Amino acid sequence: AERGELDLTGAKQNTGVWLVKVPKYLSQQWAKASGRGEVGKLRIAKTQGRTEVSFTLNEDLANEHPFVLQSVGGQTLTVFTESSSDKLSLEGIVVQRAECRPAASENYMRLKR
Amino acid sequence: VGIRFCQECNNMLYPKEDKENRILLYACRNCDYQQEADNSCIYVNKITHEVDELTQIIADVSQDPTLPRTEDHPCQKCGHKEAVFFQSHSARAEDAMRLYYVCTAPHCGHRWTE
Amino acid sequence: GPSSQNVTEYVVRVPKNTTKKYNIMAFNAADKVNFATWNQARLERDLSNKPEDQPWLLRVNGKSGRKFKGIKKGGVTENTSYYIFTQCPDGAFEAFPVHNWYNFTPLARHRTLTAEEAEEEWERRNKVLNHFSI
Amino acid sequence: EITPDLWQEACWIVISSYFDEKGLVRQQLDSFDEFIQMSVQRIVEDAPPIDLQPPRYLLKFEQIYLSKPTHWERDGAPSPMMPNEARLRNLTYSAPLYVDITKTVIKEGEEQLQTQHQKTFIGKIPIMLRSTYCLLNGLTDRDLCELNECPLDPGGYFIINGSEKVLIAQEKMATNTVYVFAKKDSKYAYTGECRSCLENSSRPTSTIWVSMLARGGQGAKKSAIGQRIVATLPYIKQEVPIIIVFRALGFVSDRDILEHIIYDFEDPEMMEMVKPSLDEAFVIQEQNVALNFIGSRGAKPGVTKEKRIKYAKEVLQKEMLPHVGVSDFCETKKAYFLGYMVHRLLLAALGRRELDDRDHYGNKRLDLAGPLLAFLFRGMFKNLLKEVRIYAQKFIDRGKDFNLELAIKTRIISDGLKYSLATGNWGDQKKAHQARAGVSQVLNRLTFASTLSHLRRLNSPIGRDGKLAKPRQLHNTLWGMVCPAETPEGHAVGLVKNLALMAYISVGSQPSPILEFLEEWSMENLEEISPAAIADATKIFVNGCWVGIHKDPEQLMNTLRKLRRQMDIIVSEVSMIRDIREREIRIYTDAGRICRPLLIVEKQKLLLKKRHIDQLKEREYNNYSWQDLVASGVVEYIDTLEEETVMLAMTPDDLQEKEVAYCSTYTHCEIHPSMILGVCASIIPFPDHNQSPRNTYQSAMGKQAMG
Amino acid sequence: ESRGFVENSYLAGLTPTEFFFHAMGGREGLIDTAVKTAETGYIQRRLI
Amino acid sequence: FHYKNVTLGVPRLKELINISKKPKTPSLTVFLLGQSARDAERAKDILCRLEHTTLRKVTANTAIYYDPNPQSTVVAEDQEWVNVYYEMPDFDVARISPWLLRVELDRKHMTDRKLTMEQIAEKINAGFGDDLNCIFNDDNAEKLVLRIRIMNSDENMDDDVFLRCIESNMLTDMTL
Ligand SMILES: [Zn+2]
Ligand SMILES: [Zn+2]
C-alpha cells in the first residue's frame, strides 16, 4: 500500500481491452449519452471470409457507424489507471484497436472515377 | 561481411580475440555479451566494382511513358514480344553503352542484358 | 471456426464518469516482455523534472527488478478521442476514455559515462595515433 | 467526333479562349489581391498581445478594413481621387487602413473591465491599378473613357508621387527541400542544405548544413577510421557531430539512432560508412551532458550549467527545422527528417544518386508583388507594436491612466511603404546600406509593346559583373516558360529574362484539405509505425514535410492526377511528382512555382473532341469559356518538376499515329509550339529562318521604336 | 538530328527544334565578346 | 576548347603577364633519344616507366580474414600454395599473428605496366620495414593473390585497427 505502487492484476490476469478511434462530433454526441451513459448498440457479423462490426446510435442519442479494425502489432499496448484516490492500477492489455468512420463520406466515388 | 547487434543493449558488436581456443569472438563495448563467429572473416573491399546493375533496376520501370520500346527481343520467361530498354544511367561510365531490357507484360518483371 | 462463422450483437455504453483516469501503457513488441516475470512493480513520476505532465518511472519487482521510463505523447485527443472497450458479464460493451499516452522504453543500468573525461579521451586518441608518423 | 487535320484552325480557337479570360498581366494582379485579402489579415491576427503593468492591461487586434482611395483637401474635406489627378498633381494613389482594438484592464479589482475601439486608423497602403480595390475595377469602356483613361491600358503598377512604378519579380532558391552539392575547394567532401520557414511567419529562414569531412586528411589517426559526418547548426559557433545532436533529442541508444538513418540492415556498405561516426560521438553518452556540449558554444557562453541546458533547449527546438513543427512536443518528427537528411547524404557518397543542380529551373521560386509587400509589412507592424510599449510604460509608471489613440504613430506604415517603393532599396530609411537594390523601377512608356514587356520580367539576384557562365547560359528546363531569344547585351546578359506567352505563376493555397484526404486513404502516420516496415514503402512528402508512408503509390498518383484533371478537390495549381526509382512522392501547394497548360492524352487519342470546338467558337452568347474547359478534364497545368515525369508530343496529327513509332505512351500534347516565345520576340515574321543572335538584337530593339 | 545537327539552309528555313539549338550556339558566341573587351583593356593598361 | 588540353589566348597571356605559380594545365613536353624514338614498344615501356602508378590501380579486392593458424585456411582453396610454403616453414620467431590480410590483383592492370608480384613483394617489404610478411601464388594460376601477416615480434593499441590503417595506407601511398 503506497502511492507509487502499481497494481499489476489486469496484466497478470492477461485482461484484454479494445481500442476504438471516434470522431469528435460523434464524441460530442456521446457526451450527451442517453440515460446513465448508454449511447447505443454494437453489431458484429462474422463470415467465412468477411467480418463486419458496426455501432448504431441510441434513438435518444440520435436526437450506422462501421468500425475499421486497426493492427496493434509492432507495439504492445496496455491500459493503466489513476483513481480519484490516486491509487494506481493496470486494468489490462490491448487486444484490439479500431476506428469508426462515417459511412459514404461524400464523393470518394467521384475521386475513384 | 555483415554486421552484428548485441542481444541485450542493441548496439554494434565488435570483433575480439581470445588466447585460449583460437576462435573469433564478437564482443560488446556497453555490456560484455559474447558469441563466436561462423565465417571467421571481417573486412572485404571490392575495388573492381563490377556490380551488374541487373540487381539494382526495378521491375516497375516498364510503366514509364518516356522510354523506347522494341518488338524484336521477346521475353524468355513468359514469351511476351515487347520490351523496354535503356542504358546504365549510373557511375562506372567508362565503357558503359550496354543495353539492359525489361519485359513489359504485367506481372513478369523479367530483366536481362545482352 | 467461430472467427469465420461467428456472429453476435452487444450493447455499448459510454458512462459520463469513472472512478479512475484511464491511460495507455505501450511497450515495444521487439522486446517481447514476459509480463509473468513481473512479480511486482513500482510506478512513480520521474524525478529528473525535479505532476500530471510528469513522465512515469516504472520499477518492476519492488527492490530487485527491471526499470522503464515513460514519455508522454504530444497529443491524444487533438482530433479523435481514444476509447477503451471492455466486455462485461452481461455481454454488453463498456467504453472507457483514454486520458493520456505514455511511451515506455527499456533502460540500461550498466555502462555509466562522463563526457568531460571522454572529451579529453577523444583528443588524446586523436593525438597519439597522429604522432610517431613516418 | 475526332478532329482530323482541321487542327490548324482548332488550336488557335482555344488559345483565343485563354487570352480573352486571363490576359497578359494576370501575373501582377493576382498576387496583389492575395496580399491584401489574406496575407495582411494574418499578420495582425497572429501577433502577440501586449499585456503590461498593481493593475495590468490588455490589447489585441481583431479585424482589418479598407476604404476606396481618398484625398484630403486643404481644409479637411475628403473626396475620392481618380488615377488621373494622381498623375497630374504628383499625388500618391493609396487607401486608408483601419482596425478593431479591444482593451481589457486586469487588476482583479472584483471586476474585469473590457472596452474596444473599432475602426482605429493605422496608415495608408498603395493600391495597384485595375485591382479589386481600385476605382477602375469592373468598369465598361464608356466609363473608362469618361475618366480620361485608356481602355487598353493593362494596369499592374503603382502611382507614387506622380511617377508610375513597377515591381520586378525576383528569383530565389526553393525552400524546405534537401540539396546535395560538393564544394571542391574546402574541407568538405559533400554537403546538404535545407532552408526552412514555418508557413510565412518568420522574418529570417534558418538554414542547416550536414557536411562530411574530406578523405585525404593528412594524419595517421583519421586515416584508418575515415570521414566523420558533421553538422553546423545555426546560432552556434562550432561544428557538432551528428550523434551528439541526435542524443540531445532523446534516443541515446545506438540501435534506435541507427534505424532513423539506415532503413534496412541488410546493407553492409552503408553501415560501414556510419561506423566511424559513432567512435568520436561515443563521448556524450547521455542527454544532459550532450545539451551542455552544444550549449557551451552559442551566441553567449553559459557561465552556469542550467542556463546552457536551457539555452540549448530552444535553439534545438525553435531554430532547428522550424518547418516540420515548432511546438516543444512532436520531436520524433525532427528526428526522422534529420535522419532522412543524413540517409540522403550517404547515398551521394556511395554513388547511388546524382547530385542536385543549382540552375535547374525546378528548384527556383519567384517573388511577385504579394510575397514582397507582405515581407515588408511584417517589419513595420512589429515596429509599430514595439513603440506602443515605450509610450505605455512611460505613461503608466506615473499611474495616471492609458489612452491608445495617441499611442499609434501613423507615419510608420504610410511613409514606410511609400519610401522603399519610390526609391527601390528593399529596406528602411536609416537602412540605405543593408538593403537589396534594383527593385521597383519606372514603367517604360516608349511604345505599347515596351510597356507589356516590362510588366513581365524576371531577375536573378546574382551580381552584374561576375564572370561565372553557368548562371548566364540557357538551361533546357527553360522550355516553354522563359523566352529563349529575348535578353539584353552588355554586362547583364542572361541575368534579366522575360517569361513566355502562356506561362502562369501560381499564387498559393493551404495544404489543409489534402492532408485530411490523405489520412483517410490508408496513409500510416510516422509515429504509429515500426521502422522495419519502411524498406518497401514510398515516403509521402507534402510541401516539404515528411508526413507518412504508403504501400500503394501509383494508384494514389493517378487518382490524384485524375482529381487534378477535374481539379475536383485540388486547386488545379498543385503539382504532384512521383519518382519510381527513389521510391517517394512529393506534393506542392506553395506560391512561386511556374506553370503552363498542356493537352491531356489518353491511350493514343486526344481528349479534345470536336464537341468542345463547335461550342467554344460561341463564347459571346453561350457562357462557355476557358474555365469550363479546365473543369472538364481536357487541359491541365504542368509545373517544371512534374515536367520530368511526362512524355510530350509536339503535334497531334503527326506524332500520335500507330506505326513503327518513336514512343507509344504519350501522356500530353502541346497546343502550338509557337507559345515558347516572349512578347517582343513574337512580332518577328519567319524567325525560324534567321541566325540566332539576330533574333536577340531585334527583341531588344523593338523596345525603342517610335509609335 | 536529336543533338544539334541542323540539316536545312537559311533559305529553306529551320524547324523549331533546330531554331532552339541555333539560339544556344549564338548565345554563347555572344557572351564571349562581352567578356573579351574588359579583359584586354585592363591587361594592356597594366602593361603600359 | 576547339582545337587534349592546352591553354592559349588572353588567359594564357595573363598567365604570362604575371608569373603566378598556377598555370591551369602545366605540362612538360618530352622527346626521346634512342631507337626508342622510332619503335612504339620502347616508347611505351618508357611511358609506363615514367607514369605514376599506385596500388589501388592494380588490385581487384582485399579481405581481412582470421587465421589463428596458417594451416586453418578459412577460404577453401588457398591451402595449396600456403601449404607448399608451410613445408618450408620460416619466420615463426615470436608467434604467428591470428590476423591475416589477403589481397587480390588484376593481371590486366598488372601486365600493362609489365609488373608481376615479385617486385611488388620485395618492395612492399623493402621500403616499409620488415613488420610485414608476404607469401604469394604462382602466376600460372589465373588469379594473383598474396597474403600478408604482421611480424609476430610485436605480440610478445589493437592490431585490427592497425591492420586496417595499414591497408588503407598502402593502396594510396604505394609508389610503384
Ligand atoms: Zn551490448
Ligand atoms: Zn516477360
Swiss-Prot record, chain A:
Modification type N-acetylalanine: residues: 1
N6-acetyllysine, modified sites: 21, 32
Superkingdom to which the source organism belongs: Eukaryota
Compartment annotation: Nucleus
Family, as annotated: Belongs to the TFIIF beta subunit family.
Known partners and oligomeric status: Heterodimer of an alpha and a beta subunit. Interacts with HTATSF1 and GPBP1. Interacts with URI1. Interacts with GTF2B (via N-terminus); this interaction is inhibited in presence of GTF2F1.
Role summary: TFIIF is a general transcription initiation factor that binds to RNA polymerase II and helps to recruit it to the initiation complex in collaboration with TFIIB.
Protein name as catalogued: General transcription factor IIF subunit 2
Range covered out of full length: 2 to 129 of 249
UniProtKB/Swiss-Prot annotation, chain B:
Zinc finger intervals, TFIIS-type: 71-113
GO biological process, one term: transcription initiation at RNA polymerase II promoter
Gene3D superfamilies membership: 2.20.25.10
Keyword Chaperone: no
Zinc finger region(s), C4-type: 6-31
SUPFAM superfamilies: Zinc beta-ribbon
PROSITE patterns the record matches: RNA_POL_M_15KD, ZF_TFIIS_1, ZF_TFIIS_2
Compartment(s) of residence: Nucleus, Nucleolus
Residues at which Zn(2+) 2 binds: 75, 78, 103, 108
GO CC terms of this entry: nucleolus; nucleus; RNA polymerase II, core complex
Binding site for Zn(2+) 1: 6, 9, 28, 31
Record's keyword terms, sorted: Acetylation, DNA-directed RNA polymerase, Metal-binding, Nucleus, Transcription, Zinc, Zinc-finger
Domain of life: Eukaryota
Presence of the UniProt keyword Transferase in the record: no
Gene Ontology MF term list: DNA-directed RNA polymerase activity; nucleic acid binding; zinc ion binding
Family of this protein: Belongs to the archaeal RpoM/eukaryotic RPA12/RPB9/RPC11 RNA polymerase family.
Protein task: DNA-dependent RNA polymerase catalyzes the transcription of DNA into RNA using the four ribonucleoside triphosphates as substrates. Component of RNA polymerase II which synthesizes mRNA precursors and many functional non-coding RNAs. Pol II is the central component of the basal RNA polymerase II transcription machinery. It is composed of mobile elements that move relative to each other. RPB9 is part of the upper jaw surrounding the central large cleft and thought to grab the incoming DNA template.
Binding partners and assembly: Component of the RNA polymerase II (Pol II) complex consisting of 12 subunits.
The protein, known as: DNA-directed RNA polymerase II subunit RPB9
Native source species: Sus scrofa
Gene: POLR2I
From Swiss-Prot, chain C:
Post-translational modification: Phosphorylated on Ser and other residues by TAF1 and casein kinase II-like kinases.
Modified residues (Phosphothreonine): 114
Compartments in which it is found: Nucleus
Record's note on what induces expression: Up-regulated in response to enterovirus 71 (EV71) infection.
Physiological role: TFIIF is a general transcription initiation factor that binds to RNA polymerase II and helps to recruit it to the initiation complex in collaboration with TFIIB. It promotes transcription elongation.
Similarity comment: family membership: Belongs to the TFIIF alpha subunit family.
Quaternary structure and interacting proteins, as annotated: Heterodimer of an alpha and a beta subunit. Interacts with GTF2F2, CTDP1, TAF6/TAFII80 and URI1. Interacts with GTF2B (via C-terminus and preferentially via acetylated form); this interaction prevents binding of GTF2B to GTF2F2.
Protein name: General transcription factor IIF subunit 1
Species per Swiss-Prot/TrEMBL record: Homo sapiens (Human)
Designated gene of the protein: GTF2F1
